[PDB]
């Protein structure tokens with residue numbers, strides 16, 4: 476139960492679950508919570524998971540360049556990502572560096588009008604009424620390069636493992 | 651609509667959902683996500699909501715005094731609390747100050763041994779095998795004094811409001 480194979484298997488399962496978030500609108504990994512260091516303490520919010528790569532150790536989100544979270548990352552790129560997956564009895568906590576890249580205008584062109592329109596409205600969080608900004612370039616990628624995965628497995632008894640770059644081997648820790 | 655009436659009702663809805671969270675184990679508000687400032691960037695994790703007071707604008711969690719989250723809060727009391735409630739189409743983000751208080755020893759006396767063990771044994775996060783920690787009085791209250799609530803209502807289209815202590819009146823903001 477404690478073997479290296481089990482640890483490896485548990486990490487593979489975590490990445491499998493991220494993968495399901497990219498494929499299934501109804502899975503909890505569809506909607507991870509991203510924390511940033513904000514202007515007066517930590518801040519967090521839901522995003523849609525767009526892509527995941529176990530090999531590259533990345534998770535990808537899309538966001539509005541004009542939004543506060545992007546300003547937070549510009550000043551401090553250190554982020555954390557969380558999912559609670561109760562049907563699988565798994566909590567996943569990840570530490571990452573968030574990198575900001577331009578969005579794919581081919582994807583932007585495929586977005587529904589409402590989504591397209593929302594990237595070109597007021598700055599998110601601005602008190603209404605407010606002026607819009609028709610800049611399609613607001614469409615932005617957040618590529619989160621994971622450095623740590625802490626996974627709690629709420630079986631009997633609880634088990635918890637932590638995996639850290641660069642080794643990513645995994646160690647059992649006390650819940 | 652965008653009336654004062656709708657604004658007031660939306661914050662009432664938030665507090666009713668926190669209420670459900672204390673009472674119903676299967677409700678998403680049972681398990682909100684708490685963000686802290688950690689040792690190297692932001693951190694977050696799931697806790698169990700134990701109590702909520704609309705009148706005092708507080709949320710209460712129980713935790714192990716020896717856990718890292720407590721150490722985080724010792725260095726920086728600013729925290730954020732998040733719940734995604736898909737069935738209500740609500741995301742709630744709350745800014746708070748966390749106070750760490752002793753637990754009620756009469757309640758600790760009344761907990762099952764499975765529950766009591768959440769506050770015994772090794773220091774959470776310690777690599778195994780881990781020595782039991784002998785600190786007295788590890789059963790701890792984490793009281794979050796809320797200062798701002800940012801509510802996103804994922805209607806078609808979305809509406810979003812921000813409410814601020816001590817009056818909690820609200821303003822509409824851009825999603």
Ligand SMILES: Cc1cc2nc3c(=O)[nH]c(=O)nc-3n(C[C@H](O)[C@H](O)[C@H](O)COP(=O)(O)O)c2cc1C
Nearest residue numbers: 506520521522523537538539542543544599600741
């Ligand atoms: C279910 C759901 C999905 C969301 N998906 C995204 C998203 O993918 N990108 C994004 O920028 N915001 C998304 N949001 C909105 C954010 O949670 C947030 O309100 C907004 O991005 C502002 O965050 P900020 O003020 O920290 O920048 C989503 C919200 C909900 C609850």
Ligand SMILES: Cc1cc2nc3c(=O)[nH]c(=O)nc-3n(C[C@H](O)[C@H](O)[C@H](O)COP(=O)(O)O)c2cc1C
Nearest residue numbers: 566627681695696697698712713714717718719774
């Ligand atoms: C469903 C569930 C409920 C949890 N409830 C609590 C709890 O209320 N108190 C607590 O300290 N940890 C709770 N945890 C475990 C924490 O999420 C976390 O692993 C532990 O408290 C350590 O956090 P820290 O390392 O930042 O201190 C819960 C985890 C799961 C997913």
